[model samples]
Target: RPRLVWTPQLHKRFVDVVAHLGIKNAVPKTIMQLMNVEGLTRENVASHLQKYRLYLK
Candidate 1:
């Protein structure tokens, strides 16, 4: 299977974009936790992405 590899810059950009949603605590644990969800719904993806902004900016 192919992997969605994100560069450091891209990762930062994602975090910045999501930060606009006011999502707090942008850490490895938080990100992994959000991605580890069994269902893996869009809402959950968006929720996890919202915090990516914090890591970038």
Candidate 2:
């Protein structure tokens, strides 16, 4: 696939979902299930969640 660019808006929405759903429970895997976002997969969130956790911590 091409252009998996997670724009700031949608990315923020995903974070919104995380914030709403609770942080630790919303692991990339849980997010992969709960988020239901397009063009998203565990591999993608896997990387993003690293920063997400850093900021949370």
Candidate 3:
């Protein structure tokens, strides 16, 4: 199957979860718990988090 696209809705939810947890507190495992995206996994969350962190920089 093709890789899932990172839609704006999903990104928004991810950012919200990160904001709620604070940057330092946010992590892949926690993000996976908070985000509702079906088929989202820890590795996916970690990948997104890396991108998000880069964006913040």
TM-score of 3: 0.89
lDDT of 3 at 1: 64
lDDT value for model 1: 0.49
Write one digit per residue (lDDT tens) for candidate 2, span 10-54: 688778878877755877778777778866888888888887778
Please provide, for model 1 over 1-57, each residue's C-alpha lDDT reduced to its tens digit, 9 standing for 90 to 100: 354455576455545544533445644445445445343345444554555445558
Query: What root-mean-square deviation over C-alphas does model 3 reach?
Result: 1.0
Q: Which order, best to worst by TM-score? A: 3, 2, 1
Sliding window of 10 residues with minimal summed lDDT for model 3: 1-10
Model 2 CA deviation exceeding 4 Å by range: none
Instruction: Give the least accurate 10-residue stretch of model 2, judged by summed lDDT.
Output: 20-29
lDDT preference between candidates 1 and 2, better one = 2
TM-score of each: 0.36, 0.71, 0.89
Please give the lDDT score at residue 52 for candidate 1. Answer: 47
Q: Determine the backbone clash count of candidate 2.
A: 0
Model 1 poorest 10 in a row by lDDT:
32-41
Model 3, span 1-57: residue lDDT tens: 688788898889988999899877799999889887779999989998998889889
Comparing 2 and 3 by lDDT, which wins? 3
Best by lDDT: 3
